[PDB]
Design an enzyme around this catalytic site. Structure first.
Site, PDB file in Angstrom:
ATOM      1  N   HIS A  27       0.837  -1.180   0.000  1.00 60.78           N
ATOM      2  CA  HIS A  27       0.000   0.000   0.000  1.00 60.78           C
ATOM      3  C   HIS A  27       0.881   1.241   0.000  1.00 60.78           C
ATOM      4  O   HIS A  27       2.029   1.214   0.458  1.00 60.78           O
ATOM      5  CB  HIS A  27      -0.911   0.000   1.223  1.00 60.78           C
ATOM      6  CG  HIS A  27      -2.057  -0.954   1.122  1.00 60.78           C
ATOM      7  ND1 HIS A  27      -2.905  -0.986   0.035  1.00 60.78           N
ATOM      8  CD2 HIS A  27      -2.510  -1.898   1.981  1.00 60.78           C
ATOM      9  CE1 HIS A  27      -3.830  -1.908   0.230  1.00 60.78           C
ATOM     10  NE2 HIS A  27      -3.616  -2.476   1.404  1.00 60.78           N
ATOM     11  N   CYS A  45      -0.322   2.458  -4.308  1.00 59.68           N
ATOM     12  CA  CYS A  45      -1.119   3.659  -4.556  1.00 59.68           C
ATOM     13  C   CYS A  45      -0.312   4.905  -4.218  1.00 59.68           C
ATOM     14  O   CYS A  45       0.568   4.883  -3.356  1.00 59.68           O
ATOM     15  CB  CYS A  45      -2.407   3.626  -3.747  1.00 59.68           C
ATOM     16  SG  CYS A  45      -3.452   2.258  -4.242  1.00 59.68           S
TER      17      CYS A  45
END
Lengths: 91, 140, 7, 91, 140, 7
Positions: free
Chosen positions: B88, B130
């Site tokens: 992430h 991301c």
């Protein structure tokens, strides 16, 4: 003398500010594309040629499927940052 | 003359950090699919000639320590270096299992003045994460 | 098909 | 559909957070390098080859001279950001 | 199949923004040498085949209007588009004569959903500006 | 040489 920041390359799956997409069954879009291109051309192409083709494959071959319509049919473009001073071949 | 010199005993090290599971307190969910990524990347980079090492579910301190040690090793006989982060992220930032750390602080270990054995050699970082919360709606 | 926060 | 952020290229004179150097008598380092490469190869080389050679020349050929010792003997590496999906030749 | 289609009547427009003198409110100094740079860039990009126009000492509003208006022109017969910015800068921002504007706000006018006539065509931005106050001390 | 503020 040589700049301390020379000779880095950053291959990001997406552009600043954006999500990055991942298929739970096939893997992330950027990695799928990267491994595909590297199998066929990893020893033949310069690194920027490889990553440019990865850019094209992610841009054209992938569109998100989602129940949630806010996340439906979205697109992705990877992002390469190069401080390299020479062409890079794996040979 | 226009290419990086590749005449070394070794292509070099390729460190993969494969982050799939995250402490609840971070608010992050499990990254299903990332095992398939790590397997496919390990096979690609081994096939290219890299010494591939795969780390799993690393804390932020672990990640910083991995890379700090990797930059302190002797790369004299290696042609380049590669690092692959699967995790992430948000802008400028990547998640360990226990929180976030800045990406520049992970890569600054390999700056020229801090890793003299990689001077004039390509240091490559591939980052699946991301970088914010925007979505690209596309256009025909 | 998932993303890599909801801010 | 194709991504809205695709097919941009940013050629920056320097990396984020850093100063960018300019000689008042000869022009900025990055532009001198860019025009010199382009005059010799603008119609032979792909854009990433051009900019990589610009990176090399800025990194190797330039080192600042200042009265201030805090600004003396400093260096610079430019920085390329590519969302291109194809090779670009000016041909 | 792997190169951009260059079979157009024009290579494209090239906008050079050349900011030498700044208002006293900004406290930024005169950028001596930027005129030699603009002329050199003018001849190179002209020689490549671009239709170059140089705009001198622009304000932030002029810069956003020049690029917005260029975005709204018809590029059906152009291969690509180039923009060269020569000015003072800090991270993510570029100085006008009067103040700063975010670089992202100048370039966003050319996104695929705001300029259909450059869809699938390269948009190139060359930026000579500062991005912060750090100095690269180098290493032998 | 000179730079392109001292913040």
């Amino acid at each position: 003398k040589i700049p301390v920041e020379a000779d880095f390359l950053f291959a990001y799956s997406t552009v600043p500010g954006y999500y990055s997409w991942r298929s739970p069954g096939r893997g992330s879009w950027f990695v799928q594309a990267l491994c595909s291109i590297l199998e066929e051309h990893g020893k033949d192409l310069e690194i920027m040629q490889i990553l440019t083709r990865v850019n094209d494959r992610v841009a054209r071959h992938f569109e998100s499927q989602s129940d949630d319509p806010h996340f439906h049919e979205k697109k992705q473009i990877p992002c390469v940052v190069s401080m390299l001073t020479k062409e890079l071949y794996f040979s | 003359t226009y290419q990086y010199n590749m005449n070394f005993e070794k292509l070099g090290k390729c460190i993969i950090i494969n982050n799939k599971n995250f402490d609840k307190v971070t608010g992050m969910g499990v990254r299903n699919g990332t095992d398939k990524d790590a397997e496919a990347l390990f096979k690609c980079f081994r096939s290219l000639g890299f010494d591939v090492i795969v780390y799993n579910d690393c804390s932020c301190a672990k990640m910083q320590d991995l890379l700090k040690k990797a930059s302190e090793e002797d790369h004299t006989n290696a042609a380049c270096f590669a690092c692959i982060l699967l995790s992430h992220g948000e802008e400028n930032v990547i998640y360990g299992k226990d929180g976030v750390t800045p990406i520049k602080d992970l890569t600054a270990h390999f700056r020229g003045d801090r890793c003299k054995t990689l001077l004039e050699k390509p240091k490559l970082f591939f980052i699946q994460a991301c970088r914010g919360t925007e979505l690209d709606d596309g256009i025909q | 098909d998932e993303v890599x926060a909801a801010a």
